[PDB]
Design a protein around this ligand. Structure first.
Ligand SMILES: Nc1ncnc2c1ncn2[C@@H]1O[C@H](COP(=O)(O)OP(=O)(O)OP(=O)(O)OP(=O)(O)OP(=O)(O)OC[C@H]2O[C@@H](n3cnc4c(N)ncnc43)[C@H](O)[C@@H]2O)[C@@H](O)[C@H]1O
Ligand SMILES: [Co+2]
Length: 214
């Protein structure tokens, strides 16, 4: 099973990807997580994203396309995968189409802009696994600790309010057109498209998605 998650920054894609990964046994491909990992480890493929993410700008299509191709070519992706934050632009989506990377579901997370800022300020992350929590809306079982490893959670470096707003502007300019892109694909029978209300509680969004995936 191959899935794309579409949605604005902070819409909850990473949150719901964990449940889909757990239940269907497919790896999460989060280009944001992969880029931050490459910066932290100084990997030749990705370390260039340091200054770009710090400026709250998008990374070149060329770099993330290469990262995704490398990641997809791994053993754990022959049985499907979930794309989280990719594709982010029309060229990235065209790059998948050119490579024959068809997908079974495209799932759009609808969240009003006005909710994004308050979500990000409360976000806490477990960098090794990409698991994310919210101190108010989705807290860990123990404050400041990852539910899985018990390790101390951190805050992402690019989560200042000004940076979130810059990322939302880029989303609407560059990424929102993917709604129509994949709606057209679904109308041609190439994928299943579904829009979910991302303002519901986490467990309810999970249930709505479970009803789609089966
Ligand atoms: N393909 C690409 N091309 C170019 N550049 C790329 C790229 N991919 C990455 N990059 C670069 O990398 C940077 C970061 O990318 P990325 O890592 O993708 O971050 P982002 O774009 O800011 O999106 P988020 O990860 O913040 O949103 P999310 O949907 O995962 O929300 P989450 O589940 O965390 O939830 C957010 C918060 O809300 C909470 N929450 C979740 N669900 C709910 C709910 N139902 N109710 C209440 N709160 C909730 C969570 O607890 C959490 O605290 C970009 O700026 C870009 O430069
Ligand atoms: Co995310």
């Amino acid at each position: 099973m191959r899935i794309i998650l579409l949605g604005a920054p902070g819409a909850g894609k990473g949150t719901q990807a964990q449940f889909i990964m757990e239940k269907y046994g497919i790896p999460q491909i989060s280009t944001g997580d992969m880029l931050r990992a490459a910066v932290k480890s100084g990997s030749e493929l990705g370390k260039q994203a340091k200054d770009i993410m710090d400026a709250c700008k998008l990374v070149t299509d060329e770099l993330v396309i290469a990262l995704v191709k490398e990641r997809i070519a791994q053993e754990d992706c022959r049985n499907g995968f979930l794309l989280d934050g990719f594709p982010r632009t029309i060229p990235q989506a065209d790059a998948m189409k050119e490579a024959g990377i068809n997908v079974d579901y495209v799932l759009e997370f609808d969240v009003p802009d006005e909710l994004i800022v308050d979500r990000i300020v409360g976000r806490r992350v477990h960098a090794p696994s990409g698991r994310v929590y919210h101190v108010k809306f989705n807290p860990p079982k123990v404050e400041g600790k990852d539910d899985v490893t018990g390790e101390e959670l951190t805050t992402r470096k690019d989560d200042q309010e000004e940076c979130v707003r810059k990322r939302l502007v880029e989303y609407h300019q560059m990424t929102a057109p993917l709604i129509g892109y994949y709606s057209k694909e679904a109308e041609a029978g190439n994928t299943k498209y579904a829009k979910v209300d991302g303002t519901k509680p986490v467990a309810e969004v999970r249930a709505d998605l479970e009803k789609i995936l089966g």
